Amino acid sequence: ELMTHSVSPIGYIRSCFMEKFAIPRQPLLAPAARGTLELLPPFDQVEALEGLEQVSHVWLLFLFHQALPRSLGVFATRATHRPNGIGQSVVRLEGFEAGRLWLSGIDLLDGTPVLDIKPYVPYADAVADARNGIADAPPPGIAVEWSEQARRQAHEHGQRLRQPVAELIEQCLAQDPPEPGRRYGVRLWDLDVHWHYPRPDLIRVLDVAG
Amino acid sequence: MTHSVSPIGYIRSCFMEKFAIPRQPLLAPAARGTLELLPPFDQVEALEGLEQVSHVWLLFLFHQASLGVFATRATHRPNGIGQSVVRLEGFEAGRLWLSGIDLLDGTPVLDIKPYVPYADAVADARNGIADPGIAVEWSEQARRQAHEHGQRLRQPVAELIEQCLAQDPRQKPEPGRRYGVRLWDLDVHWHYPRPDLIRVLDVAG
Ligand SMILES: C[S@@+](CC[C@H](N)C(=O)[O-])C[C@H]1O[C@@H](n2cnc3c(N)ncnc32)[C@H](O)[C@@H]1O
Numbered sequence: 001e002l003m004t005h006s007v008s009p010i011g012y013i014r015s016c017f018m019e020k021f022a023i024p025r026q027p028l029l030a031p032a033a034r035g036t037l038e039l040l041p042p043f044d045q046v047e048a049l050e051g052l053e054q055v056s057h058v059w060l061l062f063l064f065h066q067a068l069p070r071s072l073g074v075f076a077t078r079a080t081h082r083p084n085g086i087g088q089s090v091v092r093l094e095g096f097e098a099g100r101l102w103l104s105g106i107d108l109l110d111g112t113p114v115l116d117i118k119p120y121v122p123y124a125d126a127v128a129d130a131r132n133g134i135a136d137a138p139p140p141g142i143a144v145e146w147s148e149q150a151r152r153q154a155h156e157h158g159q160r161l162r163q164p165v166a167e168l169i170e171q172c173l174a175q176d177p178p179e180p181g182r183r184y185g186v187r188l189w190d191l192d193v194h195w196h197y198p199r200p201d202l203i204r205v206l207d208v209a210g
Numbered sequence: 211m212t213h214s215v216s217p218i219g220y221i222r223s224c225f226m227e228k229f230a231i232p233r234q235p236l237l238a239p240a241a242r243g244t245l246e247l248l249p250p251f252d253q254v255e256a257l258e259g260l261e262q263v264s265h266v267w268l269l270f271l272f273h274q275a276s277l278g279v280f281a282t283r284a285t286h287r288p289n290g291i292g293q294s295v296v297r298l299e300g301f302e303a304g305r306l307w308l309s310g311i312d313l314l315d316g317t318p319v320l321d322i323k324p325y326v327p328y329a330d331a332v333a334d335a336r337n338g339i340a341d342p343g344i345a346v347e348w349s350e351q352a353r354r355q356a357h358e359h360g361q362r363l364r365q366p367v368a369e370l371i372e373q374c375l376a377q378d379p380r381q382k383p384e385p386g387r388r389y390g391v392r393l394w395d396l397d398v399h400w401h402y403p404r405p406d407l408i409r410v411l412d413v414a415g
Pocket residue numbers: 019020021023024025063064065066067078079080086087088089090107108109111112113
């Protein structure tokens with residue numbers, strides 16, 4: 001209470017993800033998860049980005065605006081409910097324009113306000129001797145197969161959106177999560193994707209529709 | 211759109227000034243400090259599970275602050291937020307013991323995040339825009355002074371001095387000029403008897 005500091009977004013995320021549900025736990029292994037960072041008036045000049053052409057990945061500090069709280073403690077986790085509500089993700093930088101970044105392998109909701117962009121520095125950010133017992137390894141993963149209709153539908157909508165719809169669906173579903181006959185759904189881009197569990201360890205994509 | 215943040219705690223650090231803070235802090239394990247957490251984050255329940263994590267991220271405020279700013283880790287940046295990974299040596303109720311830090315004394319900490327190797331260590335990452343080592347020798351007096359102040363402070367003064375100097379705290383150093391840095395309540399003095407050798411002259415405080 002004896003110190004308050006005010007932050008304002010430098011830009012907003014426009015993302016493939018419209019819901020928190022099927023957003024990957026290992027985002028950088030979902031490289032088809034694409035999105036853009038639309039930068040705000042004073043940070044939209046190309047000069048604020050000069051040099052990023054030689055950096056592959058960037059950190060984004062952002063606000064968990066849809067995370068609406070100290071058995072693990074909050075500071076031992078990467079949970080979205082935190083005392084100052086700030087997130088941090090490293091995403092691949094595919095390219096950039098004047099007031100726009102093209103991002104890949106994101107774990108960010110659509111409409112995420114971004115407070116900062118930091119270049120990933122391997123000698124400082126990749127700690128080889130780091131060990132995390134609660135982490136250890138990315139999530140296990142599930143096999144994904146396609147109905148013939150869904151494969152064709154993902155291809156059509158992929159050509160329409162100019163997005164790798166099929167790969168994103170496959171990469172998101174290999175995580176996910178129950179019932180064997182139930183079809184589940186997620187909104188990706190402007191699409192509704194439906195799937196089910198023909199076997200406890202196999203997901204089958206049913207249909208992709210706008 | 212405005213959002214307000216307040217510190218969860220403040221850093222108590224060995225570094226009182228920006229100069230000679232190592233450019234690779236995690237290779238300076240004697241760069242020690244603590245994070246004193248304020249209430250309601252003083253309760254140990256907020257830290258349960260940290261016993262199995264080696265390193266931690268600290269989001270903090272740069273309270274004492276032709277590449278683009280977003281292409282750098284500069285301390286003068288929009289919203290003024292820093293991000294550092296430090297080794298976690300231990301934790302008690304409202305205190306974290308940190309090692310290999312690059313943070314000024316009195317820095318407000320906004321968040322604590324566990325370092326997750328599979329998510330934070332990008333093996334195929336590449337950074338061209340980002341930016342060696344020098345030999346260090348000691349005068350007998352400075353060796354004795356660093357040890358005495360280390361026992362008084364209960365801090366590894368001699369190791370921190372050597373670890374900071376070994377990264378060449380530096381555009382060219384003059385041969386007759388004395389250079390120095392404040393560490394804790396000490397003023398450490400050295401010079402360059404040769405362009406590839408640092409000699410520690412004195413430790414005072
Ligand atoms: C456990 S978090 C880790 C996020 C980030 N890598 C970090 O460590 O700060 C992963 C969840 O972030 C959530 N998320 C992403 N953007 C969000 C937002 N804008 N508001 C609330 N939650 C969000 C998604 O649901 C995603 O599954």
